[PDB]
Design a protein around this ligand. Structure first.
Ligand SMILES: [Fe+2]
Ligand SMILES: [Fe+2]
Ligand SMILES: [Fe+2]
Ligand SMILES: [Fe+2]
Ligand SMILES: [Fe+2]
Ligand SMILES: [Fe+2]
Ligand SMILES: [Fe+2]
Ligand SMILES: [Fe+2]
Ligand SMILES: [Fe+2]
Ligand SMILES: [Fe+2]
Ligand SMILES: [Fe+2]
Ligand SMILES: [Fe+2]
Ligand SMILES: [Fe+2]
Ligand SMILES: [Fe+3]
Lengths: 170, 170, 170, 170, 170, 170
């Protein structure tokens, strides 16, 4: 028996949503780790700390939006282990911004694949859901982090990193 | 000669819009009937009365939005009889929620087919109009009614129906 | 056996109430059709659009008042198909006001026959219900539409129609 | 050697965005010219002046939205000459509204071709961006101008044109 | 060499803080799973949904306070995989409250062991941190959950569960 | 036959006003290009972006002031192609400020020549119009840009540029 709300919602879409939930939880964990590292006494960049805290929270919210969507469509949420980040440490502000862009792009390609899944299965509603709730945000973020990387190179290490961080804080 | 505004609007889309206008007006009528049945002295469930009143109003508003859209694109509205509902009476609260779910699913499949019409004819604007104004709402409604059916089964007949109805009223 | 509330409510009155419900819903549909027609790109009279929208809504409200009354008295609402209007278009502002007057008079005569049903069966409460909630409004409406027809004749086609329509909008 | 933000953004799309930019800047210039013309001492229709001023501004805003989008995706803005309009004058209010409708339709077809480009390259983000920022507005404009042309024909020359112009002014 | 802030902070304390961070993240994930389960269409208990949402947020907050504390003392945060919960599905309200109590007791025993660690290494500040920020909250939660279980047993299944859930929603 | 308002308005002045309209439009387009260049991901100087956006808008406004003036005097606006800027990309902040100064001085010379036209033809009203609405502003912009170039040299590349851009933003 299909679940009562189930209508035009393929099993491959359902599976793919579960995968995407894990990815976003993972991304939130990476950002968490990045955030806490910048508040170490021997790193001490509170603007990077704050920027990656926000990132972490946003990723977790996106995972939760996917959880809700799964149940709304009549799919069943299947959770997996949230793997630990690749690194304990994250280097300079610039390095960590480069790390963040790579993660964002990874998550973006996963979202575009999830969109392609929905399209294949003629799931118009799921297409819209993804476009509105995920895709726009992702291209804004990629643009912003890329701007930050240009500026971190432009200011250089030492005082430059310190002044960039202050302006991240605001 | 086409109408002045007409641009990228197929006759099949135009026709399908008129069929959907009828469908939504029909659905409004069915909810009208349900609504008033629940205010009978020998039924007397004001929460269900209110819930199906709102449903009826919302289905008329969607028919009207489709009427407006037809003329905006340069289509011509063609109206047909609004058929009377299948029943005069609607049973218990649970029965009526099951009837509601079937109607919402039927309306949703028609919307999905209207979207496929728009897509076949490469009517991007129409696909967007349908996704934003119809498809989102329909999946919310399907989920809500499914929740209600679970809770009506969980409370049982009698006092349980009465208490659920109070909660619908708020 | 009779319904629990029922007292001094004849079967003929109950039947006639059902017929009146259909009539008013039909009237609402005619005014819906008129209203939309006036927002076509090749008609484009927003004052007439608004006027007939209001009319449509009012008719539906009166149908709904009769639905409620039927159940208040212990009668049973019996719905029928809502027939499609006799036309798809509606001509000039003047033509459509003439159409409206004929519809209002037809609905008035039905109301008056419904009152006579109530009087025949010595249903004083029904008579009072009909006078207060329907008859007064109908005389006012018939007068107003008559006034509009004199003015539409007085202004003439073209600019005059346009300026009448602006005043309808207000 | 792709730009840092670049992800799922075809060169075809990039170049089509540049062409659209030019087209909207052109359209803004046509509307500028029209707007000015209607404030000539020998034309003197301030409501048409204002209507085409607004249109000019909106077209420029949409060119600028496309400029911002190009850079957001990692594309590079390439500007071309903004060609001067086909005419120095613009005739009557009615003639100018006919001109405006032809311009809007032509901009709309370009937008629809831009959407087809995006679709062909499986650019889901781009599809959405065009739907929500461009396509909706364009169908509304086309309908409005079409309504204005009906009314300008209804009112006729002379006093009729003067009264329509007032109403445009508000 | 030790980190700059390091003073009176044992490696065993540092290690045990990392273990506790993992445990609280794990507990937050179990509560996440429970919370979403309760909003399934075929479960539909919004009060349990909300209760476990709040539980999940609080657990995450307590993990984050441990992260901050690790870095404040000069320790180094070490993250591990956050294991998926034991179940995908969580039964009745009553079953899930029993599950929650067993989780809270396990988290409390770990906190008490963490306090023993701090005491063995004569870390007065740590003891005070644990008492104030963790231990009080835990005994309250354990009391509250225990009260809920008594009440869930007292109301029984069906309507009783529904009414308890309303009261949780408040 | 002259236009009705025409008085003391030489054809050479009318011509020269059309040329100045084009110049200002061209200057607005140059600044628009400069503006959008500084928001590229690989340039990322939002203060410079803002500064040249304002410049672009101001130039447009001054073109439109000339447009209005032409029609006020009874002249006839004649539009020409707005040529595309000399460059696609505009170098560092300092380079672009040097570009801006040269543009400003070119536009100021044009204004001075337009004043000389008006003076030759004993057009006292025009001389004033130019002095008040154009000449004052242009010596302000020339002085401010000159100050900015001194400070861009003072601060140097890298962090200095970054900090000057922040101050531009404010
Ligand atoms: Fe995300
Ligand atoms: Fe993100
Ligand atoms: Fe609907
Ligand atoms: Fe609905
Ligand atoms: Fe009526
Ligand atoms: Fe009426
Ligand atoms: Fe446009
Ligand atoms: Fe969309
Ligand atoms: Fe437009
Ligand atoms: Fe905890
Ligand atoms: Fe807790
Ligand atoms: Fe200027
Ligand atoms: Fe200037
Ligand atoms: Fe009376």
């Amino acid at each position: 028996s299909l679940s009562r709300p189930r209508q035009n919602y393929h099993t491959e879409s359902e599976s793919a949503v579960n995968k995407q939930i894990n990815l976003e939880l993972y991304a939130s964990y990476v950002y968490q780790s990045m955030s806490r590292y910048f508040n170490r006494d021997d790193v001490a960049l509170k603007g990077f700390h704050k920027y990656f805290k926000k990132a972490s929270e946003e990723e977790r919210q996106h995972a939760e939006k996917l959880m809700e969507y799964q149940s709304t469509r009549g799919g069943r949420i299947m959770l997996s282990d949230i793997k630990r980040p690749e690194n304990d440490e994250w280097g300079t502000g610039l390095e960590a911004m480069e790390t963040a862009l790579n993660l964002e792009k990874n998550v973006n390609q996963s979202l575009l694949d999830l969109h392609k899944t929905a399209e294949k299965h003629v799931d118009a509603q799921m297409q819209d859901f993804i476009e509105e709730n995920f895709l726009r945000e992702q291209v804004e973020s990629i643009k912003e982090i890329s701007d930050h990387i240009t500026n971190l190179k432009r200011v250089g290490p030492g005082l430059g990193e310190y002044m960039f961080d202050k302006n991240l804080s605001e």
